[PDB]
């Protein structure tokens, strides 16, 4: 029974391992990137990095980001949308440039399309208590598209006159009346550029807010 | 146009299958007979005792 | 030594003794017990505002069921300030268990107003500063309530243990005495009716030793949550505040009731005044931002401003 | 131009269909009335093998009915000793989101696959002593669902692309392809002579395909949802499936259609995983309800539960020999039972 | 009425009564200044260190001219635990003027000590972090020798106080007392030889208060900068264990020396073990984590 006291020591050996890489991996933050194609992600990836399933590797004070790209993955969502379900945050990239663009694959503006896809991200069954940091991207090549474009042509229904900070806002706020759980997650709306502004902090602060949320939801404080 | 296999892939199983249609109370049959006839080596069906159960001793 | 013999020359003279009676003022009886009445009065309007409100956000951000405990031990303390005018004849075997029944409703009070207060900063500490994306702080009020019961527990072995063992005799005691220098000699005779118990200064440097360990952890605490969060849920000013009044008013009660038993209203009216000063100041700082903070919150939880930190990392001159 | 063809079709089913009762004379539920049941099942969680941190998605044991591989999302593939809750190994995938894990009959290799769209070959006995990728198979278009070894040489997988490949594994190459499906392959299942494979795919369908050449035998429907799981009966003519709408079938190869059905008015959580006893008298499935039920594969009673998970049961496993059943689940916890 | 007849009688029979004489065994002392003496070549050590090493990193971002007024406040702390094993008189009236002097570089000493502790919290709480562009670099060495001197002006003005207006006089007491419970008589006979002084608990309550509102602001100020750095620069956990050690030793030996005066010797080691641990403690606290990345980086 010595081979068999060998044998116990590897087996604790491999159990005290996996309390390392454990506790490692527990430090890291899991971003699931979504998004229609074409609307920013490869940009929005690409400041992240330069601060099948892709995964991106970024860290920004301290904080080790995972970014977990499956625009690829041509299957079916539902039978995988159960893995993720323990990811920090989702990040959502949506082009503002869609509004008065139809898609590939007509009558229907990309946007509405971005829009039926927010929608059941945010309200799955798998989501119901996770984050979302939604980027909207191209603010100067939509600002000067709504200059001789009305939003009228996405929305029979807006109002408001054909300025972009009026007409970014309402698609903000369009974007977050598809959200049916304010009780418990909420919606961290940014602009962005092809230029990365803040990007990377807004992410920061965004997932920060969110750890101390949940700390808190845990003690029942919040 | 490249739907063109599946009518041959229809065929082909009808062949298949038709070659060979014995009756649902053949299958039923050699089913029972199967599981009646390795029934007291499954452990499962009937519990194991404790003198040669690996996962006790 | 004729001092013996002079022994039983008085024992015939002490078959009597003198007795006590009642000297409180009863204005400052009066003044007291309303002042007392009405900070009971807010007590129970704090709780029913908690109650009331437990599903606020804010005041679900700040612990109502501590704050709740808070409250019990302050409406402790209250009682016992309310005990301290209890001076009037009653019994000997009753004013033993009077004093010993008021001061350890007082510790115990102590006790269940600063455990709670501890808890919610530690709890705020751990929160606000272990963020790690896949463990989560997992504290309940359970646990807080757990920390305050043996925090209880200890504060009443060691009052166990004190009258079990120690408990306050009080008795009649009539003495001469003469003191000498190198050079001078005089006498002096006094009687006194004092309520103490032998080895007193033991049980008060303990038990205020175990406080003045548990006010210094709490300073830790607070100065832990320095800039945590925002009034209503920081809480660090409160305890700031809660334990430098409680050394104040601990050493000055002392040393009053130690030096002035011949002035029994200065004694009554600063020991009440004391409790009463340290118990609402507590409470008024835990209380006051819910009160102000309840009402900019129905409309819409957008102002959300608790979330702040303070963490950087840059060189050192 | 396709109307003739799209009637043809048609008519090609209702021919199906009525050769179907043509030859279903009766059905399972009658001829064994007879038997007398099987009676309580009771089973005892034996061990509990503790390790795993994320959800376990996958099992499978080793031929030798004692050495156990499992697969969890926390990126790690454990091989555990199931007398005595050893590790043996601990291996560090190089992408964490698995979703199946097989074990080589002969033993010396185990696969794993997921979302990266690559079934990766482990060599477990390799002379440094370490574990190494021998291989990584590349060429599917969609997440790999399971993955299954002929020999050390052959493995077929499923993936989410519709399609089933038979691999290679020294030249890694795509041996032969499985079209057909329209849905993505959720599961597949050797038979014991391992020269029939079937595969369930989300389309609600099921089919039979010869390894040999790769051309589809037979087409099983009865499922109104995507099957999830699926495997042989022990003498290799019979397999039964698992579904998401709480209902298991099974279907025979020689009579071409389906033979009984094993669903419950109170289960409205979809299946996992199936998986016939050694005799084939048992047929246990895991739920989403957090616990196992133990069906008896002729009278379709639930004959036992195996209630020691808090949380989905993602994975089953029966030893060849039949002496134990392994119960994978997403609270990171393995259970032999007996 | 009637024991007044009894006083007068026994006051003239008091012959002068008598006198009695305590010693301590030299083996005690013995150990006590074998402890006391190697602990006090720790501090002149440390003291050397600093200074010879006043240009290295480290002595530079650990504030070495406070750690200075630091290690001299231990010197006056040792020095009076070095008085509490003298016990014979000088003058004669030099008891009195010896206990005075014992506790007042005793209280000098333990304000000396942390001082600069709580200055160098406070420089740091400042600078690191309450950072807007604005840059604090005002707070130099002079303001915080400022502010420890504030704290000795405010203890000396205490024992200043406590020496000109109830000093510690030694009597001779003798005394005869009945105690009469509810239902019984009994008798004692006293006699007592103790240096003290009348409202001593006032002294006591005072300059215990003013260190312990010290403490507790020391306490905040550690808790306040218990992320900022590493211990050579931290000194959180130095201030956390010294203030502990501090109310503990204070609590032990204030009760044995007020219920255990008839055992000398054992009063006189308590109190010479708990003023050389929390010195000692706080000294290696604060130097040790210094004197490893000297020998570290060199
Ligand atoms: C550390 C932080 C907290 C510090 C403490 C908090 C401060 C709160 C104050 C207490 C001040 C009042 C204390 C006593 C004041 C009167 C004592 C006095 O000086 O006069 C007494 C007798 O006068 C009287 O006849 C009493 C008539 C009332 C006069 C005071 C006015 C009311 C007072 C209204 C103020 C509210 C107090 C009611 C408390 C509620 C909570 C705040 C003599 O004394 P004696 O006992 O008879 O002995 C004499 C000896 O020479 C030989 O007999
Ligand atoms: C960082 C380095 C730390 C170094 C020190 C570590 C521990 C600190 C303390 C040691 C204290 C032991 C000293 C013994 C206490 C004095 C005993 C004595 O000498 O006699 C006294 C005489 O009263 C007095 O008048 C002297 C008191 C006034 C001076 C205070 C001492 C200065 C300062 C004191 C300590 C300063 C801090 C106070 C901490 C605060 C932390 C909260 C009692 O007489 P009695 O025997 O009770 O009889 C009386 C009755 O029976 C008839 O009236
Ligand atoms: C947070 C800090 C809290 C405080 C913690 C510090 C405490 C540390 C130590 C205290 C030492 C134990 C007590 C010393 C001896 C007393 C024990 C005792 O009981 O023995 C005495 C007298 O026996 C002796 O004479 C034996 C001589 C030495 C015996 C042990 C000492 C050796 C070694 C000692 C250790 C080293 C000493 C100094 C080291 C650091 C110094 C910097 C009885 O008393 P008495 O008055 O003579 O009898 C009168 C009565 O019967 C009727 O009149
Ligand atoms: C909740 C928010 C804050 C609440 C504000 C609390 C205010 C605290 C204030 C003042 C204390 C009340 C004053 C009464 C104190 C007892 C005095 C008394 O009445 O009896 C004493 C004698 O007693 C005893 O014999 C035993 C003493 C028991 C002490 C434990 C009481 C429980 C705990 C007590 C402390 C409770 C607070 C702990 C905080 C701590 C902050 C540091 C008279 O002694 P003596 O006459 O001089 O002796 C003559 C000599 O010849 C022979 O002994
Ligand atoms: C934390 C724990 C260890 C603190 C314990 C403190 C104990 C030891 C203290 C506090 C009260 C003190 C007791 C008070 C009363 C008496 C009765 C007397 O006739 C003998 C001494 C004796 C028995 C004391 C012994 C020491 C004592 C029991
Ligand atoms: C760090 C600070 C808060 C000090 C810790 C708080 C407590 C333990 C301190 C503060 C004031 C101190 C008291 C001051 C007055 C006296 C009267 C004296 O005759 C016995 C000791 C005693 C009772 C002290 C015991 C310790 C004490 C109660
Ligand atoms: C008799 C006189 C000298 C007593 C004075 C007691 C004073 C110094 C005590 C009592 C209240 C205490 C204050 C309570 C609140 C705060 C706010 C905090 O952010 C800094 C500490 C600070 C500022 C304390 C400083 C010390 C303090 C002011
Ligand atoms: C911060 C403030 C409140 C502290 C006040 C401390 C005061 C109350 C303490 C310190 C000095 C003490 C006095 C010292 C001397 C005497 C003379 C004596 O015949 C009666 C007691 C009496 C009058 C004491 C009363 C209480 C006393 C005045
Ligand atoms: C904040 C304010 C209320 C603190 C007030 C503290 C006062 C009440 C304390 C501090 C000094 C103390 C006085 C000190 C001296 C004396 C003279 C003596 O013959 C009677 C007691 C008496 C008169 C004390 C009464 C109480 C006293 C005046
Ligand atoms: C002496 C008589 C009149 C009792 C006086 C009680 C006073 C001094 C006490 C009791 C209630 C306390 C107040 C409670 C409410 C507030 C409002 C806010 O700013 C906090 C401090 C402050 C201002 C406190 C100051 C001190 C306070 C006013
Ligand atoms: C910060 C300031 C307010 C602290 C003031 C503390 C003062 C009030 C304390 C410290 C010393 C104490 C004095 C010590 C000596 C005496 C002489 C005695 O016969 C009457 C009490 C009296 C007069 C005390 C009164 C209160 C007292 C003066
Ligand atoms: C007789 C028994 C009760 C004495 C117990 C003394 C204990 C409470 C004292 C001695 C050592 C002290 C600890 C020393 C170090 C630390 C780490 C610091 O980050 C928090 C304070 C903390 C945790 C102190 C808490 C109080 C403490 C634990
Ligand atoms: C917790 C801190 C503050 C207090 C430390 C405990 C000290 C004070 C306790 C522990 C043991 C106690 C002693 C136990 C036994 C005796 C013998 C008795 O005839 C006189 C009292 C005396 C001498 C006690 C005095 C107080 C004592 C020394
Ligand atoms: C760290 C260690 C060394 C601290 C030890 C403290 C010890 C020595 C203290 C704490 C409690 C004290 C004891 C308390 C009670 C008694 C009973 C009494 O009839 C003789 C003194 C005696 C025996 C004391 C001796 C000294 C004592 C035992
Ligand atoms: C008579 C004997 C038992 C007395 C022993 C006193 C010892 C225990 C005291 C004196 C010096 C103290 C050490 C001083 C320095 C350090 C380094 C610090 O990083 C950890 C605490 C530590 C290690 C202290 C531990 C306790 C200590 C070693």
Redesign the interface.
């Known amino acids: 029974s010595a081979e068999?006291k060998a044998?116990?020591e590897?087996?604790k050996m491999?159990?005290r391992?996996?309390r390392e890489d454990?506790?490692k991996?527990?430090?890291?933050?899991?971003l699931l990137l979504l998004g229609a194609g074409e609307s920013g992600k490869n940009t929005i990836v690409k400041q992240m990095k330069i601060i099948?399933?892709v995964?991106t590797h970024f860290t920004f004070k301290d904080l080790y980001f995972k970014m977990?790209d499956?625009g690829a993955?041509?299957?079916?969502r539902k039978?995988?949308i159960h893995?993720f379900e323990?990811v920090?945050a989702i990040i959502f990239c949506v082009a503002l440039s869609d509004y008065d663009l139809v898609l590939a694959e007509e009558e229907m503006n990309r946007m509405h399309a971005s829009m039926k896809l927010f929608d059941s991200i945010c309200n799955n069954k798998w989501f119901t208590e996770t984050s979302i940091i939604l980027f909207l991207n191209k603010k100067d090549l939509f600002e000067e598209k709504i200059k001789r474009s009305p939003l009228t042509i996405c929305y029979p229904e807006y109002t408001g006159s054909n300025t972009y900070e009026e007409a970014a806002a309402y698609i903000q706020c369009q974007f977050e009346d598809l959200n049916r759980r304010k009780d418990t997650k909420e919606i961290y709306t940014h602009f962005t550029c092809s230029t990365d502004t803040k990007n990377v902090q807004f992410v920061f602060d965004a997932?920060?807010?969110v750890?101390?949320?949940?700390?808190?939801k845990?003690?029942?404080?919040? | 146009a490249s739907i063109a296999q599946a009518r041959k892939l229809v065929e082909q199983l009808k062949m298949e299958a038709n070659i060979d249609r014995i009756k649902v109370s053949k299958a039923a049959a050699d089913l029972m007979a199967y599981c009646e006839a390795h029934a007291k080596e499954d452990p499962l069906l009937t519990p194991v005792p404790a003198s040669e159960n690996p996962f006790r001793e | 030594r004729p001092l013996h013999d002079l022994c039983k020359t008085t024992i015939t003279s002490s078959h009597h003794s003198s007795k006590t009676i009642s000297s409180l003022s009863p204005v400052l009886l009066g003044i007291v017990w309303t002042f007392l009445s009405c900070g009971l009065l807010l007590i129970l309007f704090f709780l029913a505002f908690t109650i009331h409100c437990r599903k606020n956000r804010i005041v679900k951000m700040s612990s109502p069921n501590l704050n709740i405990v808070t409250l019990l031990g302050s409406c402790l303390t209250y009682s016992s300030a309310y005990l301290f005018g209890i001076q009037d004849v009653l019994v000997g075997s009753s004013m033993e268990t009077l004093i010993q029944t008021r001061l350890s409703m007082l510790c115990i009070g102590t006790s269940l107003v600063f455990g709670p207060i501890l808890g919610k900063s530690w709890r705020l500490y751990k929160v606000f500063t272990q963020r790690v994306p896949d463990k989560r702080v997992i504290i309940k009020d359970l646990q807080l309530l757990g920390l305050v019961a043996a925090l209880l527990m200890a504060d009443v072995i060691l009052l166990m243990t004190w009258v079990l063992t120690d408990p306050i005799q009080c008795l009649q005691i009539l003495s001469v005495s003469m003191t000498v220098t190198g050079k001078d000699v005089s006498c002096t005779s006094t009687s006194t009716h004092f309520c103490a118990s032998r080895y007193s200064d033991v049980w008060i440097a303990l038990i205020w030793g175990c406080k003045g360990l548990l006010l210094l952890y709490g300073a830790y605490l607070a100065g832990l949550t320095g800039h945590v969060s925002s009034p209503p849920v920081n809480q660090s000013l409160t305890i700031m505040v809660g334990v430098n009044l409680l050394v104040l008013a601990a050493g000055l009660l002392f040393v009053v009731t130690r030096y002035l038993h011949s002035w029994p209203n200065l004694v009554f009216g600063l020991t009440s005044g004391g409790i009463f000063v340290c118990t609402t100041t507590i409470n008024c700082f835990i209380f006051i931002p819910q009160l102000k903070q309840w009402k900019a919150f129905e409309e819409e939880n957008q102002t959300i401003r608790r979330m702040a930190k303070y963490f950087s990392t840059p060189n050192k001159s | 131009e396709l109307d003739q063809l799209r009637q043809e079709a048609e008519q090609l089913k209702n021919q199906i269909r009525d050769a179907r009762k043509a030859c279903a004379d009766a059905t399972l539920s009658q001829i064994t009335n007879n038997i007398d049941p099987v009676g309580r099942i009771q089973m005892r969680t034996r061990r509990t093998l503790r390790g795993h941190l994320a959800k376990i998605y996958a099992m499978h044991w080793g031929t030798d009915s004692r050495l156990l591989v499992s697969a969890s999302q926390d990126g790690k593939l454990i091989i555990w000793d199931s007398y005595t809750t050893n590790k043996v190994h601990a291996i560090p995938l190089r992408s964490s989101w698995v979703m199946t894990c097989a074990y080589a009959p002969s033993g010396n290799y185990v696969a794993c696959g997921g979302l990266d769209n690559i079934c990766s070959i482990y060599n477990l006995k390799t002379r440094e002593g370490n574990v190494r990728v021998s291989r990584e198979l590349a060429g599917h278009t969609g997440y790999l669902s399971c993955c299954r070894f002929l020999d050390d040489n052959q493995i077929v997988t499923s993936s989410g692309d519709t399609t089933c490949a038979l691999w290679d594994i020294e030249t890694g190459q795509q041996t032969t392809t499985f079209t057909g499906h329209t849905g993505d392959v959720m599961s597949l299942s050797l038979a014991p002579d391992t020269r029939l494979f079937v595969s369930g795919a989300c389309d609600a369908s099921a089919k039979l395909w010869d390894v040999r050449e790769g051309m589809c035998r037979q087409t099983f429907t009865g499922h109104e949802s995507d099957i999830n799981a699926i495997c042989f009966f022990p003498n290799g003519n019979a397999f039964a499936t698992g579904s998401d709408d709480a209902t298991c079938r099974l279907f025979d190869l020689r009579a071409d259609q389906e033979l009984m059905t094993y669903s419950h008015d109170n289960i409205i959580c979809g299946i996992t995983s199936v998986s016939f006893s050694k005799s084939g008298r048992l047929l246990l499935a895991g739920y989403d309800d957090f616990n196992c039920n133990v069906w008896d594969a002729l009278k379709a009673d639930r004959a036992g539960v195996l209630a020691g998970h808090d949380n989905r049961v993602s994975c089953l496993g029966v030893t060849d020999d039949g002496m134990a059943v392994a119960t994978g689940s997403w609270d990171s916890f393995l259970k032999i039972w007996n």
Do not use: H, M, P
């Open positions: 068999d044998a116990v590897r087996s491999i159990d391992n996996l454990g506790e991996a527990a430090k890291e933050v899991k099948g399933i995964e977990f499956v993955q041509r299957s079916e039978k995988w893995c323990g920090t997932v920060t807010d750890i101390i949320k949940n700390n808190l845990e003690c029942g404080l919040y």
